[PDB]
């Protein structure tokens, strides 16, 4: 399972099981470019979030119900959707994944 492997490799579930996570299959520069696109509000209310003009290839990783450390289990869902990231810093780059419309 792609999710069970990438979450492990990326050290996301080596010392615990993370409920959800999304992996973007686009170039890093292309994703970093989102910090200058459509500005929108973040889930929390703050407004340093941005939505992509286009849809991007992504894989959603969702833990199953029976999952428990040390045996985390994930449901893999591939899709193409707009991403919403919160930016910060200089250069202005993404630091959090807010959602995917």
């Amino acid at each position: 399972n792609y999710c069970n492997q990438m979450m492990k490799s990326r050290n996301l579930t080596k010392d615990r099981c993370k409920p959800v996570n999304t992996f973007v299959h686009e170039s890093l520069a292309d994703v970093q470019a989102v910090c200058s696109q459509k500005n929108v509000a973040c889930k929390n209310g703050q407004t340093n979030c941005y939505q992509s003009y286009s849809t991007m290839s992504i894989t959603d990783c969702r833990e199953t119900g029976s999952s428990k450390y040390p045996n985390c289990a994930y449901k893999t869902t591939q899709a193409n959707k707009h991403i919403i990231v919160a930016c910060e810093g200089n250069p202005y780059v993404p630091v959090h994944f807010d959602a995917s419309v």
């Binding site: 686009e26 990231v85 810093g89």
Partner: peptide, 15 residues
């Protein structure tokens, strides 16, 4: 050690 931007990259990027 690992910055907020580096964390994002390790956790979400997979070109």
């Amino acid at each position: 050690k690992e910055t907020a931007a580096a964390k994002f990259e390790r956790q979400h990027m997979d070109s």
